[PDB]
Amino acid sequence: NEVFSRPEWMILTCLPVPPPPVRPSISFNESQRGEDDLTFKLADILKANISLETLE
Amino acid sequence: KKLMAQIFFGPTYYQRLRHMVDDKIHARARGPMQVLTRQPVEGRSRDGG
Amino acid sequence: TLKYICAECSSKLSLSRTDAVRCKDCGHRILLKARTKRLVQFEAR
Amino acid sequence: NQEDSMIMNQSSIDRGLFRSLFFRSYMDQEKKYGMSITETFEKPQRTNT
Amino acid sequence: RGPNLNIVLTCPECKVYPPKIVERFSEGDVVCALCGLVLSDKLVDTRVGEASNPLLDGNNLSTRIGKGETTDMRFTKELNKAQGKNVMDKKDNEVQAAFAKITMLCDAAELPKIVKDCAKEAYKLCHDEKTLKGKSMESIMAASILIGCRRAEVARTFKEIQSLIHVKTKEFGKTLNIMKNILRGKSEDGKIDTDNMSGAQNLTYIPRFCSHLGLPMQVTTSAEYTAKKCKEIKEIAGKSPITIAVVSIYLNILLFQIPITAAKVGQTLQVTEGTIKSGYKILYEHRDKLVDPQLIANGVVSLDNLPGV
Amino acid sequence: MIVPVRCFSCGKVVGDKWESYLNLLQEDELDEGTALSRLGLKRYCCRRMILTHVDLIEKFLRYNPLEKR
Amino acid sequence: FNMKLAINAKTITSGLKYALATGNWGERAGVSQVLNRYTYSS
Ligand SMILES: [Zn+2]
Ligand SMILES: [Zn+2]
Ligand SMILES: [Zn+2]
Asked: Binding site for Zn(2+): what residues of F are annotated?
C-alpha cells in the first residue's frame, strides 16, 4: 500500500522503544529489583548500537 | 416404621482423602490485579479470580 | 526474659538478641521456644 | 447420597469418627543483603516501621 | 534539582494531613481510615523478569548467547566472537573477572556465602581508586576476603589466608590498612565496623582450633573462659592472640588429661613448641585465676591435675 | 492413637475396657472373640471399636520427652 | 603450585547437589522428586 506499507519500511532504521508498562520491573521482596526481559534485550541493542557507531 | 426393603448392612473400611472443601471454597468480588496485564491474580491463596 | 529449651539435652536456656543461638551445656544448635505460660481456653466438642 | 454422595452420622462425627490433625510449617530466614543491609527478627512498631 | 513527580494519597473530605491510610490487599482498595472513602482502586501486587543485586554489579544488563533447540556452531562461534570485541563491557569485565576469582578462592576454602558476598562488595567499593594502583591483585583479593570474614564474625587468621593466597605479609598488612582507611573514608561520606572489627577478637578462633584437635565441647568452653580471663595478666595480654588461644587450649588439654602431646598440637596449629611451653610458664603462675569456678566447684576438673614445673 | 472413649455408632463407653481386653488376651489365654463378649461388647459396632484399635501411644512414648521438668 | 587451589571441591559438591536437588541430570528431568509422606503406603 502506497501509504500504509511500503517495501522500504520493511527495513528497520529507527527502532521504537516500548514504554515501561509493556516491560514492567517486577519485585520479589521489594528490597531486590528485577527488570523485564525486554529491558535486558533493549540494553544489549543500545550497547551494540553504540559499539557499532564508535567502531565505524 | 419398618422399611419395606431390607438394607445391606455391615462394617467396611473407609478412608478420608486429602480434599477438604474448606481448602477449595473461595470467592472474589474485587481484589489485587497482576502488574503486567492488570487482570485478577491467579491462586486461591492470593485472593485470585 | 525469654527461656529456650535445647533440642538434644533438654536444658532450659535464656537467650538475648545478642547471644548466639547454641546450647551452652551440650553444644547443640537447635532450640525450642518454651511453652507459653498464659492459660489457653479449649472447647471440649 | 445421590450420584456418588454419602450421608454420614452426625453423632459419629461428634464422637471422633474420621477426625484428623493438620500441621503446617512456616519457614523464614534472617537475610543478610550484602554488607550494609541486614534483617532481624523483631516486633515492629507502628511509629518506626 | 528535578521535577517532583510524587503522588501523595490524602482524603479530600477529611483533609487531615498526614492521613490515616489502610491498604486492603485482599480487596485491592486504598481507603481512608476515618471516613471510609476509597482513594485508589485496582492496586497491583508488590517467569518474565530477572532479579539482580545492584550492590555487587551495579547497573549492568547483559545477555549471553548459547545453543537452542536448533542451532549451527558457526553462528554461535562468530556471535560470541563479536560480543567479546566490545569496548564498553571491557572495563566492567575486569571487575567481573575479579569476582569470579574471589568466588573460586572463597569456594575452595569452604566458607559461607555471606563471606564471598562481603568480600566481593569490599573489592568493588575499594576498586577504581588511586591508592590501590601499585599493589598486586593477589594482595587485594586476600585483603578483601579477610575483611569479608571479619564482617561475618568468622574472621580467619593471616596465616590461614596466606595458605591459599600467596602474598608476603608486608604487602598484606599495608593493603589491609589502606583498605580499612578507604572503608572509613566512604563511611563518613554517607556502617562498616563494630566490636567485631577489632583485630584481636580471640574468642572467635577458639572453636575452630579445638575442632581441629577433636576436643569435646566441654573443653572448648573451658578454654574460652581461660582465654577471656587471660587478658587480665599484663605479661600475656601483649602476646599474639594465636599464641594466647593455643596456650590456653594447651592448658585445658592437660587439665582434662587428653592424650595429645604438645609435639602434635604445635604441628597441627603451626606453633613452635618452645613458645607453647614458654608461654605455659607465665600462664602456670596464674592457674587459680584461669580456671572456671563452676567447673572446679562441680568436681569435673581439679587444679591438682595440671602438672607443675 | 489411644483407645476411643465412646463407640462411634452407639456411644457406648469403651475407653475403660482397653486394659481389661489386653489382660484377657495375655493372662486368661482367651481368644479375641471370647474376650470381647466377656467385656459386655455384644453389638458388632462395639466389637470393632476394640478389636481394630491400634495403640500408637506406646510407640510415641518411646521418644525422650522434648521438655523435662 | 598450590594443591589446595588445584583441586576445587566445589565442582563435585555442587554437581551432585544440583543433580539431586533438581531433576536436571546434567552439568533428563524429573529424576529426583520430593518424597511423598502423606501416608506410609504412599
Ligand atoms: Zn543442649
Ligand atoms: Zn476521609
Ligand atoms: Zn457400639
From this structure: 7, 10, 45-46
Residue F1 class from Cβ within 10 Å (0-12 exposed, 13-18 middle, 19+ buried)? exposed
Q: Is E297's Cβ below 8 Å from some Cβ in A?
A: no
A18 residue type, one letter: P
DSSP string, F43-64: SHHHHHHHHT---THHHHHTSP
What is the end-to-end Cα distance of chain G in Å, rounded? 53
**Which of the residues A28, A30, A31, A33 would you substitute to probe the D interface, choosing the one with the greatest number of D C-beta atoms within 10 Å?**
A31
Q: Is E209 exposed, middle or buried (0-12, 13-18, 19+ CB in 10 A)?
A: buried
Contact call for residues E263 and E152 (beta carbons, < 8 A): no
Residues whose CB falls within 8 Å of the CB of residue B33, separated by 6 or more in sequence, listed in order:
B39, B40, B41, E28, E42, E43, E44, E45
Resolution at which this structure was determined, Å = 3.4
Q: Ligand 3 centroid vs F36 CA: distance in angstroms?
A: 12
Contact yes or no for E120/E56 (Cβ under 8 A)? yes
Alpha-carbon Rg for chain D in angstroms: 24
1.10.3810.10, 1.10.472.10, 1.10.240.10, 1.10.1060.10: which CATH number matches E202-298? Answer: 1.10.472.10
Sequential DSSP letters for E198-262 = SS--GGGHHHHHHHHHT--HHHHHHHHHHHHHGGG-HHHHTS-HHHHHHHHHHHHHHHTT-S--H
Q: How far apart are CA B23 and CA E135, in angstroms?
A: 63
Dig out the grid coordinates for F43 from the structure: 453389638
Chain D positions touching chain B (beta carbons under 8 Å):
18, 20
- CA distances E13 to E29, E33, E42, E43, E299, Å, are 17, 12, 21, 21, 77
Residue pair A32/E51 in contact (Cβ under 8 Å)? The answer is: yes
The domain segmentation of chain F, as residue ranges, is 1-69
Question: Cβ-count burial of E164 within 10 angstroms (0-12 exposed, 13-18 middle, 19+ buried)?
Answer: middle
Is E237 an 8 Å CB contact of chain G?
no
